[PDB]
RNA sequence: GACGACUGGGUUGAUAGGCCGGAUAUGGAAGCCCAGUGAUGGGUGGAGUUGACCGGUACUAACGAGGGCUU
RNA sequence: CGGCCCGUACCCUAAACCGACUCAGGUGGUCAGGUAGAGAAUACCGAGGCGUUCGGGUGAACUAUGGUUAAGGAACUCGGCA
RNA sequence: UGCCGGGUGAAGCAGCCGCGGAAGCGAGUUGUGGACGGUUCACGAGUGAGAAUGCAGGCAUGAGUAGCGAUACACACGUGAGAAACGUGUGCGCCGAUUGACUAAGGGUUCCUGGGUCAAGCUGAUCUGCCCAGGGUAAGUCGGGACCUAAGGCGAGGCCGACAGGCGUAGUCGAUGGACAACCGGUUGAUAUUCCGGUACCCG
RNA sequence: GAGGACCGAACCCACCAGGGUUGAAAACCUGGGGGAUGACCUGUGGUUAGGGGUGAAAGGCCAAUCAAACUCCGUGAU
RNA sequence: GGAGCGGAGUGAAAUAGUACCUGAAACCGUGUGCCUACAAGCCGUGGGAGCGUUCGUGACUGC
């Protein structure tokens, strides 16, 4: 019953996103929302916003309204287009700073 | 401390100005060789 | 000090595994 | 109350005194405030001591409370509205409840209120 | 005790705070009265304030077995 | 009755100028209150302004800026450097 | 140049199965791809890279590490999808020969209103000196020009110099100086010695 | 009531120490320190240009570069 | 909230979606077969048991 959504170009570094997505692999869909709800990390907000699209797609598109037999089948974060800007530092030099992005994908399947 | 560029428009038009470039024939070559190279701002 | 060599993939990943969040 | 180990709240010993004094001002003004967990723990013994002094009620104690809360209006309510309420209760005048972490700096917050 | 960790307690509860008392520390509160032209002094009174030390007191907050085989 | 042209916003001991930066630096001149004090020093205030430009805790070693040290008093050190 | 292939799927890329003594090959095959290739004999070469502290682009390691740029903010309410940072109120602290109010130089629209939160802000943002649209600077008396000249510059003729060019007279420019007539109060979101009110002054 | 006079803020400077040293800063910060009516400091406008300028003289300074600046050209120098 | 995405639709083709023909390598992930916590390793090579969606891995041992 694989239904999935994903957010692309989400402005949070891939490692910081993986820190949270590695909690929500293979648990009940609702039980995963109740974990991202009470999660200190700031990446848990975009991730839970994608976890809700997956359930919304499962209910609407494929007519699996009951969102309690679902578990996270797949969830992974892919690298995204990095932005590059500079920073003035001591003695006239400049060090680069990369503002990384990520592509978060979540897949819910029936148990 | 005090850096090596204190802007002053008056003193930058009496030194690199167009009127000054047209006074010395050595300076009119600078103007002409910038016209031929195609620059937009032809003199300071 | 400065890194003497590029850290091998095995050694890099041994460490980043330790940078994990805890289930609430 | 016993002093704090380690770094003082607000970055200085002077700031701490005025910080805890004004928090007590607000707690008596509204009866309940939401603030950082560490600040709530420091504020409990200070506020409870002030209530103890207000229970006695005499002019001398009113000076003593005034050394901490410079506001005469707040002290009036403390001696004439709050202290009568706690006439019978022997201590433990404040209740501390933990809430979720704050957004932005993930500081653990808490509610401290006067026990009804 | 850097953080983990270690130790004790978790309503069958004195773990911490508060509240009562002590011990300590300073050293004679505020108000009132008396004396003095005044600065000040005397009485009420080893007073008032007071943290960590001490005794009381519930008022506040307390994943993990089903035993391999051979001799 | 006529009296022309340019400037007139905004910043200016600075987040808008010169330093590549919202940079602990530099930037001519004018205004200049109260109390103590000789004073434009210094302490607290006025007119007026600021608290936004990463935070919350936690008594580790250690580093830096401050503070106090019994008895001795340069015995330290190249040197009373601090 | 002769002979051939191609929407019945060419080049290129990724495999699988075979082949050669090497550089390598397959008119074998599969997937991707979607319009150009194979081969005989010759002919030409910007014809083969792993190193030059080589050059350009992308991406790693150091590492979720150092730093986040000099003293204090707290609470209540509000807006809001979301608030430690945005608004309002209260309190507390700091500057105050200045963390206040102006001006020249410089900058050049950063000023005001409304809207936005993708890029920027060493976090955050509903906020911004950011982005978009619109608006805003009023002079007979303020500063300067139409008045004067200093240091100095240019310079008709002119002198000197092979050429280029150097100097300089009359003159003409050149404020940082001289001469010259307006003060108080009010107003807008943004301007005021400029507009408005009162009373003045100067030249024709 | 004179002074290249005395003490001492502004202003100019940089003797000592600590910090900073991939810094807040390609020369600064903190506390002391020197001059502080003069050979002083400073604004505006001028002016001296490379084997040359200027220099109370250190080969110092001449746009973060000076025992001979910088740019283009000879030039693909050797 | 938006961004973005899942269905749907256009298209011959939507991992051709205005970040867009082809889409290599470095680099980053998910799943999966094997090995790996008494071991000294220019990380390969010869011998070799075992396990498994000739092939993949490689206990142990020689160089």
TrEMBL record, chain A:
Question: Pfam family of this protein, just one?
Answer: Ribosomal_L22
Picking any one GO molecular function of the record gives: rRNA binding
Q: Does the keyword rRNA-binding apply?
A: yes
State if GTP-binding is listed as a keyword: no
Q: Which GO terms describe its cellular component?
A: cytosolic large ribosomal subunit
Name a biological process GO annotation: translation
Keyword tags: Ribonucleoprotein, Ribosomal protein, RNA-binding, rRNA-binding
Q: Which InterPro entries match?
A: Ribosomal_uL22, Ribosomal_uL22_bac/chlpt-type, Ribosomal_uL22_bac/org-type, Ribosomal_uL22_CS, Ribosomal_uL22_sf
**Record PROSITE patterns:** RIBOSOMAL_L22
The UniProt similarity line reads: Belongs to the universal ribosomal protein uL22 family.
* Protein task: This protein binds specifically to 23S rRNA; its binding is stimulated by other ribosomal proteins, e.g. L4, L17, and L20. It is important during the early stages of 50S assembly. It makes multiple contacts with different domains of the 23S rRNA in the assembled 50S subunit and ribosome.
Extract the NCBIfam families matched here.
Answer: rplV_bact (TIGR01044)
Its quaternary organisation is: Part of the 50S ribosomal subunit.
Kindly provide the name given to this protein in its UniProt entry: Large ribosomal subunit protein uL22
State the species of origin.
Streptomyces fradiae ATCC 10745 = DSM 40063
Which gene is annotated as encoding this protein in its UniProt record?
rplV
Automatic annotation (TrEMBL), chain B:
The gene name reads: rpmH
Q: What is this protein called?
A: Large ribosomal subunit protein bL34
Provide the taxonomic classification.
Answer: Bacteria, Bacillati, Actinomycetota, Actinomycetes, Kitasatosporales
Q: Which HAMAP family match?
A: Ribosomal_bL34
The alphabetized list of GO BP terms reads: translation
Molecular function terms, GO-annotated? structural constituent of ribosome
What UniProt keywords are attached to this protein's entry? Ribonucleoprotein, Ribosomal protein
Q: Which family does it belong to?
A: Belongs to the bacterial ribosomal protein bL34 family.
Coiled-coil positions: none
Q: Name one GO cellular component term.
A: ribonucleoprotein complex
Q: Name one Pfam family in it.
A: Ribosomal_L34
Species this protein is from: Streptomyces fradiae ATCC 10745 = DSM 40063
UniProtKB/TrEMBL annotation, chain C:
Specify the protein name.
Answer: Large ribosomal subunit protein bL32
Q: Which family does it belong to?
A: Belongs to the bacterial ribosomal protein bL32 family.
From TrEMBL, chain D:
What GO terms in the biological process aspect are recorded for it?
Answer: translation
Q: Mind telling me which GO cellular component terms the entry cites?
A: cytosolic large ribosomal subunit
Keywords (alphabetical) are: Ribonucleoprotein, Ribosomal protein
Query: Which Gene Ontology molecular function entries are recorded, alphabetically?
Result: structural constituent of ribosome
Can the keyword Ribosomal protein be found in this entry's annotation?
Answer: yes
What are the boundaries of the signal sequence?
none
Q: Summarize the subunit comment.
A: Part of the 50S ribosomal subunit. Contacts protein L32.
| Similarity field | Belongs to the bacterial ribosomal protein bL17 family.
Per its record, how is this protein called by name?
Answer: Large ribosomal subunit protein bL17
Lineage of the organism: Bacteria, Bacillati, Actinomycetota, Actinomycetes, Kitasatosporales
Describe which stretch of the whole protein the shown chain covers, with first residue, last residue and complete length: 2 to 117 of 164
């Amino acid at each position: 019953m694989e239904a999935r959504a994903q957010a692309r170009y989400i402005r949070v570094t891939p490692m910081k996103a993986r820190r949270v997505v590695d909690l929500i692999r293979g648990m009940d869909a609702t039980e995963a929302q109740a974990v991202l709800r009470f999660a200190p990390q700031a990446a848990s907000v975009p991730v839970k916003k994608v976890l809700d699209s997956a359930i919304a797609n499962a209910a609407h598109n494929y007519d699996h309204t009951d969102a309690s037999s679902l578990f996270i089948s797949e969830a992974f974060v892919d690298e995204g287009p990095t932005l590059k800007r500079f920073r003035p530092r001591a003695q006239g030099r400049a060090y680069r700073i990369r503002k990384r992005t990520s592509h978060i994908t979540v897949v819910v399947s029936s148990k | 401390s005090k850096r090596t560029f204190q802007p002053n428009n008056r003193r930058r038009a009496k030194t690199h100005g167009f009127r000054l470039r047209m006074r010395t024939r050595a300076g009119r070559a600078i103007l002409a060789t910038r016209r031929s190279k195609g620059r937009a701002r032809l003199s300071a | 000090a400065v890194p003497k060599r590029k850290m091998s993939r095995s050694n890099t990943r041994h460490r980043r595994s330790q940078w994990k969040a805890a289930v609430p | 109350p016993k002093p704090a180990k380690g770094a003082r709240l607000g970055g200085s010993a002077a700031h701490e005194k005025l910080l805890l004094a004004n928090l007590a001002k607000s707690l008596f003004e509204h009866g309940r405030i939401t603030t950082t967990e560490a600040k709530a723990r420091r504020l409990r013994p200070v506020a409870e001591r002030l209530i103890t002094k207000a229970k006695k009620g005499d002019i001398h104690n009113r000076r003593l409370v005034l050394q901490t809360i410079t506001d005469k209006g707040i002290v009036h309510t403390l001696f004439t509205e709050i202290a009568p309420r706690y006439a019978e209760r022997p201590g433990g005048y404040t209740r501390i409840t933990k809430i979720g972490n704050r957004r932005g700096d993930n500081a653990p917050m808490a509610v401290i209120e006067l026990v009804e």
